[PDB]
Amino acid sequence: PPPPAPQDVEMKEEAATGGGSTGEADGKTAAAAAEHSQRELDTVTLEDIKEGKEPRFVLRALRMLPSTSRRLNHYVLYKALLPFLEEPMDTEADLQFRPRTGKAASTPLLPEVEAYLQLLVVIFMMNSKRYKEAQKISDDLMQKISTQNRRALDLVAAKCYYYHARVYEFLDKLDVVRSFLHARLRTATLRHDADGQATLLNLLLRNYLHYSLYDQAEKLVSKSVFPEQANNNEWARYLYYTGRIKAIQLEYSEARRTMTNALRKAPQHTAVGFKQTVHKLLIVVELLLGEIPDRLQFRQPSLKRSLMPYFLLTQAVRTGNLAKFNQVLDQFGEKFQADGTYTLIIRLRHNVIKTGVRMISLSYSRISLADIAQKLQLDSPEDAEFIVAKAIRDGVIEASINHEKGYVQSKEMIDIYSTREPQLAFHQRISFCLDIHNMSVKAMRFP
Amino acid sequence: MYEQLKGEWNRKSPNLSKCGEELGRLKLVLLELNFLPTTGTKLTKQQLILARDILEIGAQWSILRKDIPSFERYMAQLKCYYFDYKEQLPESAYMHQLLGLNLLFLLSQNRVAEFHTELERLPAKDIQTNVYIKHPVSLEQYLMEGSYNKVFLAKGNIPAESYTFFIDILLDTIRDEIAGCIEKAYEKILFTEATRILFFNTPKKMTDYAKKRGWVLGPNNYYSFASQQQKPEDTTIPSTELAKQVIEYARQLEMIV
Amino acid sequence: GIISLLDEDEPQLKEFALHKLNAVVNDFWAEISESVDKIEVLYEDEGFRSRQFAALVASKVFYHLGAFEESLNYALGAGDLFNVNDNSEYVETIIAKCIDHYTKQCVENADLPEGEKKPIDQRLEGIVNKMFQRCLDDHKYKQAIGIALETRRLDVFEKTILESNDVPGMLAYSLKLCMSLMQNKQFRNKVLRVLVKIYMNLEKPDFINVCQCLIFLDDPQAVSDILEKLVKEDNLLMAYQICFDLYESASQQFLSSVIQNLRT
Amino acid sequence: MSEKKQPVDEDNWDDDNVEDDFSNQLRAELEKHGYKMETS
Predict the structure, then answer these.
(1) Cβ(C83)–Cβ(C130) under 8 Å?
(2) What single string gives the DSSP state of each residue in A414-445?
(3) What is residue A13's DSSP assignment?
(4) Fewer beta carbons under 10 A from the terminal one: N or C of chain B?
């Protein structure tokens, strides 16, 4: 008695969404798609949520003259796989409705990802995407009829390339798909820019920081910026991956602002630990700064089972205990090697000394050297002059050593009062504000 | 294969005619098959195994000859030979100290991004084994500390591995910031901080260094009486170019309306 | 990591090195991306016997980047491997934009019509007429007329009427097509007259030919040509159409032009 | 929402700043402090 209901509403899924998309895509260009055609993301993740089932919607696909009304109603009525996923090509070649080729080569095929048998149909999904990649290649050699693949099926295409990813990942890696991607880039570079490269580039970094390491420098020459960032979700996790990069490129002062940006551009919900687990390794760069506040302003108790190392670790950060250092290391270094954590163990001592020198430096105008050699667990006055020079290391607040015997003649620095440095920066503040005025201009330009 | 291949195990490099004739030999080795497009019939990879090891010892013969582009040439090559498809690469004991010399000169030319890309291309063996990489990361703890004392305190334990050409470049890359703050003919001696250059009380070595290419700051001042940074302290002439920023700001207002 | 191999100046390992180049060229894109200078070293060498394939791996890295004048330089210094290799998107995108460089080169060649034009590589146009031999063997009238007027040049357009055992209509609808789209008159005069010349010397005597150029080209010499011939074969049921079109279509001062040509 | 990597992966709690400040620092908060004045 429940399955006759998706016979109605799962039918109206393709009726409303797909029928409106294809029919309203046949005209009214660029309102052809992208007013409910790329409702596709959540309505088709929902198709994989909202609801035997496997052969039914994949038989008898390409018929004739547009009788999909009757054919999808047959798919409704029939509720009472070896050539079956290829049967949308085996009834006849599709031969009409080229906006429907990728659509029916995505939406019926993909629910086996959520069926999870992983043994016989992932190679059949590989074959179904050999068909759909034959569409992808043959759109410019055999389909010289109209656009139908940029304005609708490019936004469909990047989605089903994430589904390519979902298929390719569950068994192996991909290498041929990378030059195949850059060919897809070349047929999206100058004509019509798609994300695409950034999709499999997120995957590139995701499997490469696991397994290849030359390619950040190849990103450097490959950094076509793509300032469109329309979803902002892909762009958010793009910033997450490259912030892991600059953490492993040991770039920290950039990392704090760009990863705080990457967090605040996540509007996400569902507190299973998505935002939380991404955010923990995000503010590992703040563990690497030398400065981090108490993480009470960051914890969701669903993350608590994973951060059972992490709270005691930030305790070790705020303290300086070598016992706590090594104990958190050996005991609580599990579950983070899967993410990669052991670059903080070399410089947790640096975190200690920068936290201490921050407290003491903003605390004290003048300090003495052979007592700042005993504020923290320092070693010697030669180690203390050493660590004063290493405490500068970049251009920190004025600390001149009293170069006879007066240990240090440091003082506080001034002229941040309200004089020229803020009005040196306010041109750029209002440069950002006029950029938002350009956003207002484009707000007017949206119709 | 193809003799005079392993025949110089004891008489490795007394001569560059031996090593140049072996440059011609290895030239023909590179001309023997290819690099790595062929995998099956595994003996055609075992000549690549023997090529790996004779280019390890060729890098030994090329690091004996004190040559920078040849040794980094063979380093890029043998790095790509440890980027071979062979999962069955056996224990090559030259790997530890050739990566050690790579990492040693790699830090000696101040590539810490390349230091950590070396760390991240091998997270497995750099945990407890690979002691001639695990010892440069103890040195990375020492240089994490921002080393001038710990250069000597870590040079204490590298006495004989023929690291000499590159630990000399480490003793070059020890820095001169105290010379850039307080030195340049007088601070009586800066001896008690274990900085390598700042030893040797007054021979013409550190006299040459205290007078080296001038007095590293540059214009308008010495460090006999310090500038304490560099003496910039220019003006607020940039009030006029922020006034220019105001001009094109009003232009951008006009573009906005 | 092949610039280490590029330390060698002997090419006898550089063949193995270029076979490595087109093998891992999809991985090592940033390898050449600063090594363009040493690519120019092996390119401008007159002893390195793979400077053309050095220009091809340069085409690879500037296909990863997508530069235009580099592809012009690879049309220059890639030569044979620029010409015969044409079954790939890797080559057809960059030579497609080089055909775009050629069509704006033809824009230049129609900017100033009297000598002194900008220089042209014989290979950037060698791929034009080489791809046009595919258009001749394809024999489609799109394939003829398109590239025949993309060039804005009357020679290969003159050669398009020389195709195979068809053209029942190009020699009667070509003026119709060219008038149905024309914007510039500077060469339209010459196209319109070179077509009606071969329409006078067609296997069939046509009437739409001078019926069109007599009012869009209004020559006193062409109206005297059809006067001369249509009187010369001594038939007036054929000069019926065009003499009553001389009165019926044409306007004044063209009647003056023909009355200069009446008695002779 | 599977974002392609992440599926693989005021009771007593605002005081935590004060408490982690005060873990090994003034662990009694008074039992030395009330007794400081007779130390000197």
Answers:
(1) yes
(2) ---SSSSHHHHHHHHHHHHHHHHHHHHHHHHH
(3) I
(4) C
* Closest alpha carbon to A155 in A200, A190, A193: A193
Amino acid identity of residue C116, one-letter, is E
CA distance C39 to B5: 34
Between the CA of residue C138 and those of C142, C148, C163, C174, what are the distances in Å?
10, 14, 10, 19
Contact yes or no for A427 and B245 at CB 8 A:
yes
- Determine whether C24 is exposed, middle or buried from the number of CB atoms within 10 Å of its CB (0-12, 13-18, 19+): middle
Instruction: Flag if B35 and C16 touch (Cβ within 8 Å).
Output: yes
Both tokens assigned to A401: 């050593």
Experimental method, per PDB record: cryo-EM
CB B205 within 8 A of CB B161: no
Chain B within 8 Å of A426 (Cβ-Cβ)?
no
Find the farthest-apart pair of alpha carbons in chain B and give their distance in angstroms, rounded.
Answer: 83
Please, are residues A292 and A252 in contact by the beta-carbon 8 Å criterion?
no
Do A152 and A33 meet the contact criterion of CB atoms below 8 Å apart? yes
Of B34, B37, B73, the CB nearest to C4: B73
Residue A313: closest CA among A353, A284, A279, A289: A284
C24 touches chain B (CB under 8 A): no
Query: How many residues make up chain A in this entry?
Result: 447
Residues in chain B: 257
Query: CB-CB: which of A274, A306, A318 is closest to D6?
Result: A274
Give the Cα-Cα-Cα angle B109, B111, B116 (nearest 5 degrees): 145
Distance from CA of C249 to the nearest CA of A (A): 41
How far is it, in rounded angstroms, from Cα A325 to Cα A308?
Answer: 15
Q: How close B40 gets to chain C, by Cα (Å)?
A: 18
CA distance B191 to chain A (A): 11
Contacts of B136 in chain A (CB under 8 A): none
Residue C198 to residue D22: CA distance in whole angstroms:
103
Report the C-alpha dihedral over residues A385, A386, A390, A396, rounded to 10 degrees. 10
Breaks in chain D listed by the residue before each, with C–N > 2.5 Å: 9
For A63, how many CA atoms within 13 A lie in the half-sphere containing its CB? 13
Residues of A in contact with C65 (CB under 8 A): 221
Question: Does chain A touch chain C (at least 3 C-beta pairs within 8 Å)?
Answer: yes
Q: Find how far residue A370's CA is from the centre of its chain.
A: 48
CB atoms within 10 A of CB A8: 10
Resolution of the structure, angstroms:
4.2
B100: amino acid identity, one letter = G
How many angstroms separate the CA atoms of C212 and C214, rounded?
A: 5
